[PDB]
Amino acid sequence: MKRTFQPSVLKRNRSHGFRARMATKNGRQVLARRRAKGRARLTVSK
Amino acid sequence: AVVKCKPTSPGRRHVVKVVNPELHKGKPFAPLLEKNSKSGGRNNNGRITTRHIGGGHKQAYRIVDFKRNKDGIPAVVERLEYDPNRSANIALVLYKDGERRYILAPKGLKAGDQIQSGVDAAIKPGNTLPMRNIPVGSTVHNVEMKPGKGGQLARSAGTYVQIVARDGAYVTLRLRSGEMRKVEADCRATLGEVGNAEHMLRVLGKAGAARWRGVRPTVRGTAMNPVDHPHGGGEGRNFGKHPVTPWGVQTKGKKTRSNKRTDKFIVRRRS
RNA sequence: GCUUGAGUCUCGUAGAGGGGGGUAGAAUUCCAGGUGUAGCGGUGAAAUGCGUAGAGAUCUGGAGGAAUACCGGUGGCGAAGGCGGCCCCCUGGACGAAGACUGACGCUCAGGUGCGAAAGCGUGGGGAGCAAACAGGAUUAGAUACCCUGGUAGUCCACGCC
RNA sequence: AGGACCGAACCGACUAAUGUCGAAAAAUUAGCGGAUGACUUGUGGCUGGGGGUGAAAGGCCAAUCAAACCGGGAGAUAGCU
RNA sequence: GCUCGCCGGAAGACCAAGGGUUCCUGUCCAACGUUAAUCGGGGCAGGGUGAGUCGACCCCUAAGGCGAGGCCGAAAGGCGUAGUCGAUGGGAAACAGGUUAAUAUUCCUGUACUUGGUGUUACUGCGAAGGGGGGACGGAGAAGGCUAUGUUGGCCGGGCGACGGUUGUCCCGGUUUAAGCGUGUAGGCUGGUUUUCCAGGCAAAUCCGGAAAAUCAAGGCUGAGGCGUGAUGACGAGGCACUACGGUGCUGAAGCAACAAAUGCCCUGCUUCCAGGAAAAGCCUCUAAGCAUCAGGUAACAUCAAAUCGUACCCCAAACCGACACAGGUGGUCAGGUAGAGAAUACCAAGGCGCUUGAGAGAACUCGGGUGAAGGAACUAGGCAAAAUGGUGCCGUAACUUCGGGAGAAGGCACGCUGAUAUGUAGGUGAGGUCCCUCGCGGAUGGAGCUGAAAUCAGUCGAAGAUACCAGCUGGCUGCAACUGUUUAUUAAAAACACAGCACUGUGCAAACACGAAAGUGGACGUAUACGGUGUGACGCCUGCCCGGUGCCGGAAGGUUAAU
RNA sequence: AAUUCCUUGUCGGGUAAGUUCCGACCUGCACGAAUGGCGUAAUGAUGGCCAGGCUGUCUCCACCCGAGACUCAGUGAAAU
RNA sequence: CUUUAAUGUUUGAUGUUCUAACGUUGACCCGUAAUCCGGGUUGCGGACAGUGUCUGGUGGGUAGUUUGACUGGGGCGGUC
RNA sequence: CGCGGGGUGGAGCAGCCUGGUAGCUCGUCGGGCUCAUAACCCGAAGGUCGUCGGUUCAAAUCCGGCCCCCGCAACCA
C-alpha cells in the first residue's frame, strides 16, 4: 500500500522549517528547548 | 418552455428543463465581470459554519446595477443574458450615453424595449421610481430598504411585492411570504415582477444535478450515531425525542424571531 | 345552360354568443381601534360552541375572496353543453330590405376529427362564504342519517386530462 | 444527448485459493465492479484534541480513535496480582 | 565469443518528485550481498556536473498565509485594509551533427533568435500607482486539411548462396535532413475607411463605448503544412586501412515516388448543450500632474552585457516511500512491424534482461495446472470451485411496461485457402496532358499509377476453418432497495447511507443558524420561485381516528412568584 | 411475511421424498398507512428457490506435468 | 369608621411628541489610488435597541457523579 | 415454581381502599300502550358476595390454605 511518508522538501520546510518556528511563541519555545538540550539538528534544514 | 426529456436512461426519466429562446447563447460582458470563489461554507477560523455547501461548477460573478443611480436617462434592452448566481434572468441594458449596466429582467420584457430611471419615468414595467410617485395598489419588485441601498426584497424569479397603502412617510408593503411591512417614502421600487417566471418547475432529475449545482448530501438525524447528533442510537431506526436541530434547539414549530429593533415596522406577521 | 335550391356581395337590426384585459356597489368574514354590557347563538326543546381575558350589538377605518338584488319575463343568444353588474378590444352566428351575381357547388353520412354540465385528477397560485370526509352535541330501540356548532378536499384562477 | 451499453489505461476490492514466524504488519493468482462522471488523479494550501471531518461505520484524523501523539502534574491511585 | 530463452503500451528510452555521488576509472576481498566472488550500487585513491535561448531565481497573480495603522481581546493572541508573499498558472529568445572512460539543445563546427545599457544619424511631442483593448479560458461531439510515422515501389551498393531449386515477379541493408528567414496556403473570425457630435469610462483624453451622415464593396487579422532556402553542408551502407586487438584514422554511392495515417498539430478553432465555464502582468493604446533650443518616444546601424544557482546517475526501481538488494505503491512524455476494432492479446524490433543459491531424485503429501471410462449435483450449508458459453455479419426474438425498454432476450445460419466475376470490382487517393484566369501554394476537365472492402458462383483440404491467445452462462417465480453512486483503510459492499422528489417548520435581511469570550466571517456579495432544520425517500394509487400525557404556538384575567 | 412464539400450522402446485420456496386460508403471541402502507418497468459483484447447459463437486478417484518435500555442498533462523 | 370630592404633594404605571445620548453592516466627502477604520456633513430610527450587574424561569447543548448488600454463580423475586 | 389483580343476581360491572347499611344498566316475571310484536311507560321480586377456616361485637371486605380465570415473568454463558 501507499505508506505514511510521501516526502516533498517544500511542504517539509513550510511546516517544520526555521521560519515556521520563528512565527509563534509556541514555536519560539520549541526552538528554545532544542538549544537547552544542546541539539545539533535544531530543526530540519540542510 | 418547460420541456421534458425522454426516458432513454434511468435518471433522465424525471428531468424537466426550462428552455428560454430569449437567452443570449454567447458570452458575458467582460467589463462587468469579477471572480467569485466558492468556500464550502467556511469562515475566517476555517470551520464549516453552514453545511451542505461544496462541489458545484465554477462560476463568474456578473455585477448587477441594483441602485439605478443614473436617473432621467433612457435605456434600451440589448440582450437577455443568463446569470447563474441569480435565480432569475438578467437583461443587458445600455443607456443613452453608451454605457451597459446589468439589471434584473422583469416579466413582460423582451429584447428591444426601452426604460428610463427616476420620478419622471413612465409607469411601465421595468421602470424604477421612488414609491411616493408609484400608484397605491401597484405591483413592484426589488424594493429598497433604505433610500440608496439598491433594492433588497423580491429580487428572485417571479417574486413580487404588492404595495398595500401609502401612509405619509411610510408605505405599507405586502411581502411575498405574506408579511406586511412599512418602508420609507423615498425608497426606489421596480414595476412588475422579476422575469424567468417558470423557474419553479425545474425538477433537476439526478443526484448529480444537485451536486454540480453546489449542494451536498444531507445525512438524516436518525441515521447518525448518538454523539454525532441529538437523535442517533437505537437498534434499528428508533426515535422518541422531540425533533431538534444539530444543537438541541427544538425545530418543527419554534419561533426564533428576536430582533427587537424592527418590531416597529412589521405590521401583520405571517400566519 | 336556365332558375324557384344552396352560396357570395352592397346597407342595417336585436342580443347573458365566445376569449383576454380593467372597474364599481351591496353583503359576509376577518384585523386593529372607540362606545358599551350580560348574555349571544341554536332548536321542536336542548346541548356542543362563544362570553366578565369582555362576545353579540353599534360606529370609524382597513385587508380580502367569491358572487352580481332590482331590470328579469313559457324574454334573448348558441349546434349542444351552456351563458346574465358595468366597460374596452378581438370575433362568430342569425334575421330583415331592394336588387345584382356564380349557376345545382346540394341532402345525409359507418369509420375518422373537434366541442362537450357537474363531480374527479395533474403542476403551480388563491381561499371570504358554502361545504363531502371527519369531530362533538342531540334525535333514537341503534343513528356510522335527517336537525345543530365547527371543519379538510372541493367550489375560484391559468394551463392540461377525463 | 445520456450519473447510457460493452471493454483496456486508471480507481475500486465481490467469490475462491495460497499465504498466516508470508513476497508483503491485507498482498499475489484466476476471475470480478465502475470506466464522460456523485469520475480519477498531481502539485499547493485550509479545518485539531471534547476539537476536526464524516454519501454516517461511532468510521477517519501519520500502521494508534467511544476521544490522537509528545512532554508535564506524576513515584497519580490500586481494600488487587 | 556462439546458441537457447524472456519483456517489448514493457522487465524499453527520457523529465518532474525525492535521494545525495549510488554515475565513471584503477585497485582490493576481512565485514556487506541471504552461497561462492578475481564481481558489484561494498572498501581505498582519483576523475566527472561547462548554458543570454532548459528549469529556478526574476515580473505577475489564484486558493491561501503573513499583515503598518486600525478593530478587538485578562496577557498570549485572534481578525483584517493599504500592502507583501505565494505556482501546480500567464510572461522574451536554439536547432542539427560530431566528440568523452563519465557531461552536453551547456563543449567544438555551422547557422540563427530575444531583451535591455550606451552612442552616432535622420525624424518627432513624450510622459503615471488612472482609463480602454489584449491576455481570457467549460464539457461533449463532428468533419475537413496535414505531419510525425510506416509499408511498398524505383534507385544505389553487396550477394547469387555449406541438402533439392534460386542471374530472377531474386535476397539483404540504406534511401536521413532541424531551427530561422521568405511565401502566406487549406481553413477560421469580423463588413471596412472618413467627418461631426456625447448627461458615459469616480479628472482628462485624438483611446474605448454611443448616436447620426458619407463612400467602397472588400480590407484587415489569424494560420499547421507543403515548397524554396538552410545544405555543391552534415550524416551516410560499405570498402580501404592500422589492431596498445578496447577501437581509431581516412574516404564515401543513393538519398526520390506513391499510398496508408494518428490520441500530435491547424483547434487558445467550428457546431451544440447546459451545470454558463481563474486573475494579474508582459504587450498595444489614450492622457492628467507637468516637462518642451530639452528630457524622452520611433526607426536603421556600430557596440557592450545577458549575472547567480541546479545540470552527474537512479526517476514504474537493489539508488524514492515500505527497517532489507522487500513479488507492494509513485505523476508526466515518446511509444514501431504482422494479425487485430484497439494502447486488449499473441509473436517479434529498437533496447534491455535471464529476477544472487545450485546439483541429483522423481516417495507420501501440499501449492500451481492438464486429460479423464460410465453417470451427471447423487457433493454440499449452498452448484463454492472448475467446466462450459464467448467474435462479426445476418435472420429471428415472449411476458410485462413508465412505451426508453425488456433485448446481445431466447434460438439459429454463413466464416479457411484458391480461382473466377474483375490480368483486384465498388470506392478512395490522384501525376502527366488539355482549357481558362481577377497569374498563384489557382480553378475545371482528365484519367495513368497506387491502394482496396464485402458479396455471388465454382473447386479443394481437415475429424474440427470466429480452428490459438482474446472472448457473456441462459431462462423462470419471488423478497428488499427505485436506479449510477457511497461506507467499516486492516475480517461486515448490504435490504445500511445518499439521491432526485414530497411534507412540515423556522427566517423580512445588521435574516434564522453557525464558528468565535469579541471584532469579524460564512449564510450571500444571495434575499421567500430564497436559505436553514427535520422526517420520508423514483414513480403509480393513497396517506383514515385521538389534543388525554409530552413538546410546542397563542391568549392573557386571576392565583402563585425573584431582584428592587 | 426481514414480523407467526406455539409450528415443519392447514390446503394446493412443485419432487420418488420438500422444516426452504411459490400460491392462497386469517386463529395477526405481537402488520398497518410519511419512525410511511400496498404495488411496480428497469437496475443489482444482493437474499431465496427451480429447470436447462455444463462439468472430477461427488459416486471412487487414476495418471501425468511443473514448484517444494527426500539426498548432496554452502549459508544459516524462529516461537519454546 | 366608611363611602368619597377639590387642591397640593409624593413616587409609580401607560400613550404621544421631540432631539442632543446611542445605533446607523443608509447616502456623500476627506485622511487615501484602500469594499477595513476614524472623522466630517446629512437622512432614518430614538432614550427604544443593545451592553454591564443583580434576578426568576428554561436548559443532557456541556461537565462532574451516584445508582447498595447478602445471594447455595449473577439477574428477577425476596429480605435488611 | 414466582409477582400483581380478580371471582358479586341470568349477563356485564360498582361498593372493598379507610370493616356493621350490596348499587347501576340490560335482562326475567306481571300489567298497560297497539289489531299483534318490538320499542316505550308502570311495578315487584331477584345475589350461598368462588370455597374452607381464623380474628373482631360485627367479615363481600382483614389474613391465610386450596380450585379456576387473567396479565407478566420464565434469564446471561
PDB file of C-alpha atoms (C1' of nucleotides) in Angstrom, chain B residues 160 162 164-165 174 176 180 200-201 268, chain C residues 31-32 62-64 123-127:
ATOM      1  CA  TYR B 160     -43.111  40.440  -6.472  1.00  0.00           C
ATOM      2  CA  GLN B 162     -47.688  44.281  -3.638  1.00  0.00           C
ATOM      3  CA  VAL B 164     -50.978  47.967   0.017  1.00  0.00           C
ATOM      4  CA  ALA B 165     -51.143  51.506   1.409  1.00  0.00           C
ATOM      5  CA  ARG B 174     -47.076  43.221   1.393  1.00  0.00           C
ATOM      6  CA  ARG B 176     -44.224  37.513  -0.713  1.00  0.00           C
ATOM      7  CA  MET B 180     -46.987  43.295   5.842  1.00  0.00           C
ATOM      8  CA  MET B 200     -40.164  26.713 -10.110  1.00  0.00           C
ATOM      9  CA  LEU B 201     -40.888  23.724 -12.344  1.00  0.00           C
ATOM     10  CA  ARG B 268     -49.073  41.903  10.276  1.00  0.00           C
TER      11      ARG B 268
ATOM     12  C1'   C C  31     -57.961  42.597  11.586  1.00  0.00           C
ATOM     13  C1'   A C  32     -56.868  46.919  14.779  1.00  0.00           C
ATOM     14  C1'   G C  62     -58.608  48.811   6.566  1.00  0.00           C
ATOM     15  C1'   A C  63     -57.126  43.933   4.135  1.00  0.00           C
ATOM     16  C1'   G C  64     -59.509  40.466   1.048  1.00  0.00           C
ATOM     17  C1'   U C 123     -48.469  21.206 -11.972  1.00  0.00           C
ATOM     18  C1'   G C 124     -48.429  25.939  -9.653  1.00  0.00           C
ATOM     19  C1'   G C 125     -51.303  30.082  -7.209  1.00  0.00           C
ATOM     20  C1'   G C 126     -55.792  31.537  -4.146  1.00  0.00           C
ATOM     21  C1'   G C 127     -59.159  30.592  -0.066  1.00  0.00           C
TER      22        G C 127
END
